[PDB]
Enzyme design. Structure first.
Site, PDB file in Angstrom:
ATOM      1  CG  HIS B  41     -21.718 -11.236 -26.328  1.00  0.00           C
ATOM      2  ND1 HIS B  41     -22.231 -10.129 -25.873  1.00  0.00           N
ATOM      3  CD2 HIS B  41     -22.227 -11.836 -27.561  1.00  0.00           C
ATOM      4  CE1 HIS B  41     -23.085  -9.973 -27.102  1.00  0.00           C
ATOM      5  NE2 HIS B  41     -23.103 -10.899 -27.724  1.00  0.00           N
ATOM      6  N   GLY B 136     -27.742  -3.645 -29.218  1.00  0.00           N
ATOM      7  CA  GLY B 136     -28.887  -4.113 -28.513  1.00  0.00           C
ATOM      8  C   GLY B 136     -29.639  -5.226 -29.238  1.00  0.00           C
ATOM      9  CB  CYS B 138     -26.527  -9.251 -28.991  1.00  0.00           C
ATOM     10  SG  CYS B 138     -25.095  -8.417 -29.693  1.00  0.00           S
TER      11      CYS B 138
HETATM   12  C1  LIG Z   1     -19.281  -2.694 -34.338  1.00  0.00           C
HETATM   13  N1  LIG Z   1     -19.051  -3.544 -32.989  1.00  0.00           N
HETATM   14  C2  LIG Z   1     -18.157  -2.978 -32.212  1.00  0.00           C
HETATM   15  O1  LIG Z   1     -17.438  -2.025 -32.363  1.00  0.00           O
HETATM   16  C3  LIG Z   1     -18.115  -3.665 -30.669  1.00  0.00           C
HETATM   17  N2  LIG Z   1     -18.531  -4.987 -30.742  1.00  0.00           N
HETATM   18  C4  LIG Z   1     -19.777  -5.144 -29.758  1.00  0.00           C
HETATM   19  C5  LIG Z   1     -20.629  -6.344 -29.973  1.00  0.00           C
HETATM   20  C6  LIG Z   1     -21.175  -6.184 -31.542  1.00  0.00           C
HETATM   21  O2  LIG Z   1     -20.475  -6.287 -32.499  1.00  0.00           O
HETATM   22  N3  LIG Z   1     -22.390  -5.938 -31.532  1.00  0.00           N
HETATM   23  C7  LIG Z   1     -23.564  -5.401 -32.337  1.00  0.00           C
HETATM   24  C8  LIG Z   1     -24.095  -6.475 -33.246  1.00  0.00           C
HETATM   25  N4  LIG Z   1     -24.934  -6.071 -34.321  1.00  0.00           N
HETATM   26  C9  LIG Z   1     -25.128  -4.675 -34.579  1.00  0.00           C
HETATM   27  C10 LIG Z   1     -24.037  -3.785 -34.073  1.00  0.00           C
HETATM   28  C11 LIG Z   1     -24.161  -2.652 -34.673  1.00  0.00           C
HETATM   29  C12 LIG Z   1     -23.346  -1.416 -33.948  1.00  0.00           C
HETATM   30  S1  LIG Z   1     -23.573   0.231 -34.561  1.00  0.00           S
HETATM   31  C13 LIG Z   1     -23.434   1.180 -32.909  1.00  0.00           C
HETATM   32  O3  LIG Z   1     -24.688   0.244 -35.202  1.00  0.00           O
HETATM   33  O4  LIG Z   1     -22.509   0.498 -35.345  1.00  0.00           O
HETATM   34  C14 LIG Z   1     -22.633  -1.710 -32.820  1.00  0.00           C
HETATM   35  C15 LIG Z   1     -22.586  -3.126 -32.327  1.00  0.00           C
HETATM   36  C16 LIG Z   1     -23.480  -4.211 -33.061  1.00  0.00           C
HETATM   37  C17 LIG Z   1     -19.631  -7.528 -30.083  1.00  0.00           C
HETATM   38  C18 LIG Z   1     -19.784  -8.706 -29.935  1.00  0.00           C
HETATM   39  C19 LIG Z   1     -19.205  -9.855 -30.055  1.00  0.00           C
HETATM   40 CL1  LIG Z   1     -19.745 -11.407 -29.715  1.00  0.00          CL
HETATM   41  C20 LIG Z   1     -17.927  -9.715 -30.620  1.00  0.00           C
HETATM   42  C21 LIG Z   1     -17.318  -8.299 -30.779  1.00  0.00           C
HETATM   43  C22 LIG Z   1     -18.245  -7.309 -30.421  1.00  0.00           C
HETATM   44  C23 LIG Z   1     -17.843  -5.852 -30.871  1.00  0.00           C
HETATM   45  O5  LIG Z   1     -16.779  -5.804 -31.420  1.00  0.00           O
END
Ligand SMILES: CNC(=O)CN1C[C@@H](C(=O)Nc2cncc3cc(S(C)(=O)=O)ccc23)c2cc(Cl)ccc2C1=O
Ligand SMILES: CNC(=O)CN1C[C@@H](C(=O)Nc2cncc3cc(S(C)(=O)=O)ccc23)c2cc(Cl)ccc2C1=O
Ligand SMILES: [Cl-]
Lengths: 305, 298
Positions: B41, B136, B138
């Site tokens: 991704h 970040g 990921c």
């Molecule tokens: C909660 N995430 C989102 O709202 C957006 N989101 C971005 C991305 C994703 O999940 N990255 C994240 C990974 N680990 C921790 C994360 C903590 C946060 S936070 C600011 O601390 O809430 C945000 C994003 C995180 C993603 C990757 C894939 Cl392969 C599929 C879907 C997504 C996706 O939906």
């Protein structure tokens, strides 16, 4: 999102762990530049441990009595000196893996990572706090002596603890990297006991702010408290007194969440009175005190949920 | 004495973490030999269609302060493999392994190719991990160490609406019924890893905590009916065999310890704790207990 007990990456410390043998005793040493730091009780027998005269034991040792092993390589000891409860072995080779470092003495309530080692070989890493009674609730077996506690804020390793002993209750005692013990402890197999322990209040408050940041507010109430009324209640639950310094230190978390420190103190008061009632906070059914206000800011986001 | 949640020393893994940037997206990569592995991704979906448009120079790989030159790229399931011009001199002995629910591993959380922390966690029965991750993170990886060999088992991909995490093995196959895209996905109802709670009860007995022991024993069939009522995973004959060494070390039969767990489920702890916990802990495997109560080094 999420909140775990997190340790610093141990790589920079793994590259400093060596094995120190003196006669029959074998423990761990920390090799920084051309010096290996280790507990001075490596020169003791189990007999000597009751009332050892370290100066008398050390004056009878020569450089070649100390065997220092760095991986599969033998280091040559070219000098030795004692600084408090730490033995400093001058070696012929400077450690090429020596990181940027400082020796820091920490205060009760401060947290750090521990790299537990046996025979100069790292086995595991965990996070823990210096208790108010100056002990650490570690996980150590025989041969762990010389294992170290550290923090890696930025690219600099701050060495704050070196393991020396286990107390009758299973808790641990050690020194800073200058050989000064934390607590009223001595490196003698004499009757010593950890004093009654208390909960680190500023850390429980910090952890309640981490719960609010991760979207949990079930424990908040409409009340406030004075600092003195908070301490009169908290002391009855074996909690450390909350000082004005602690309140100032919680300022950033109070500003980030919009909850005044004394209002968070009122939630804590009510939690101590009521318990959790089948609920948990950040996956815990107890009030957690081994996360400092600094750890919470480091691990959590800047935007509240 | 003492019982902590303990992670493997992260040193061998720290030497493999790199930063991968593709356009506006920046995440972590794992540099092993002359290949950098990262979530696909980073190019964001029709991934083969997005990938065919990209050239080698669109991918910016940074190893510390050094820029790595990408000379090829391919996709394997949900992982992107970037062929680089330099083999990693700090590459350790390694294997890619797929783990099962209930198995534990260490996570080296990273941001911008820089390791920030290490923690220990378990693959839940619902295939999620209760990690601690921010934006970040990921490309952060999960691993175990067997002697000197690092077994890479997890690569972080996403956070679910409940705050739990989802990712893949190092071959790009997701753990759980998840997909790599922002769509309506939820973690299924979770269960307690029974064999791990039993292992942790044996660790408590080893550390001198026996208030929960009783004179009773039970059958596997009777215990499994109790386990089903409290959202506990079924205990198999394999689990019983696996707990054999701990049963022999403490003198407490596995179905004897099951009767204690049965009583804890029906009556609670009553103001008491086990190993400093007021909950029944399930993220220590029978092997983790033996390793921590023996002192195995790496
Ligand atoms: C909660 N995430 C989102 O709202 C957006 N989101 C971005 C991305 C994703 O999940 N990255 C994240 C990974 N680990 C921790 C994360 C903590 C946060 S936070 C600011 O601390 O809430 C945000 C994003 C995180 C993603 C990757 C894939 Cl392969 C599929 C879907 C997504 C996706 O939906
Ligand atoms: C618990 N200790 C003892 O029974 C004997 N003892 C040896 C030694 C000492 O404490 N070493 C240890 C350090 N860390 C964890 C240890 C776990 C264990 S165990 C098998 O898991 O109980 C044993 C020993 C440990 C020591 C050093 C000094 Cl500077 C002062 C006193 C002593 C001392 O009393
Ligand atoms: Cl401090």
């Amino acid at each position: 999102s999420g909140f775990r007990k997190m340790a610093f990456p141990s790589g920079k410390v793994e590259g400093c762990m060596v094995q120190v043998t003196c006669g029959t005793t074998t423990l761990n040493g920390l090799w920084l530049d051309d010096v290996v730091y280790c507990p001075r009780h490596v020169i003791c027998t189990s007999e000597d441990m009751l009332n050892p005269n370290y100066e008398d034991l050390l004056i009878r040792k020569s450089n070649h009595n100390f065997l220092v092993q760095a991986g599969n390589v033998q280091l040559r000891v070219i000098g030795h000196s004692m600084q408090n409860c730490v033995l400093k072995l001058k070696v012929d080779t400077a450690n090429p893996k020596t990181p940027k470092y400082k020796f820091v003495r920490i205060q009760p309530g401060q947290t750090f990572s521990v790299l537990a080692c046996y025979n100069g070989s790292p086995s595991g890493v965990y996070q823990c706090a210096m208790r108010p009674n100056f002990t650490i609730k570690g996980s150590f077996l025989n041969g762990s002596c010389g294992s170290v506690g550290f923090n890696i804020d930025y690219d600099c390793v701050s060495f704050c603890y070196m393991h020396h002993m286990e107390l009758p209750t299973g808790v641990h005692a050690g020194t800073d990297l200058e050989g000064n013990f934390y607590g009223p402890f001595v490196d003698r197999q004499t009757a010593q006991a950890a004093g009654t322990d208390t909960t680190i209040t500023v850390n429980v408050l910090a952890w309640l702010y981490a719960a609010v940041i991760n979207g949990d507010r079930w424990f908040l109430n409409r009340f406030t408290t004075t600092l003195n009324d908070f301490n009169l209640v908290a002391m009855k639950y074996n909690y450390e007194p909350l000082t004005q310094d602690h309140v100032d230190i919680l300022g950033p978390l109070s500003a980030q969440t919009g909850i005044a420190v004394l209002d968070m103190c009122a939630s804590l008061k009510e939690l101590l009175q009521n318990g959790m009632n089948g609920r948990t906070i950040l996956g815990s059914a107890l009030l957690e005190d081994e996360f400092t206000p600094f750890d919470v800011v480091r691990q959590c986001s800047g935007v509240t949920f």
